[PDB]
Write a protein that binds this DNA or RNA. Structure first.
Length: 59
DNA sequence: GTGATCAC
DNA sequence: GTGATCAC
């Protein structure tokens, strides 16, 4: 699904930013919690990167 | 090792 | 076809 709320992330360029992820999803093996991942675009570079989402971010 | 995703 | 994202 696509994100709605902004997320506090560290961009690849090394800066803190508040970005809305274009896609969010859960990545987890059987039996374990795994992690929530967002796909973000660095507005400074236009480069795409992934980053952990807060555990309560809605998928 | 195992899980999903997609820009490259 | 995979880098890179994390937690357990």
């Amino acid at each position: 699904s696509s994100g709605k709320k902004p997320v506090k992330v560290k961009t690849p360029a090394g800066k803190e930013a508040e970005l809305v992820p274009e896609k969010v999803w859960a990545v987890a093996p059987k039996g374990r919690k795994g992690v929530k991942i967002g796909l973000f675009k660095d507005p400074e570079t236009g480069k795409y990167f992934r980053h952990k989402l807060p555990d309560d971010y809605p998928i």
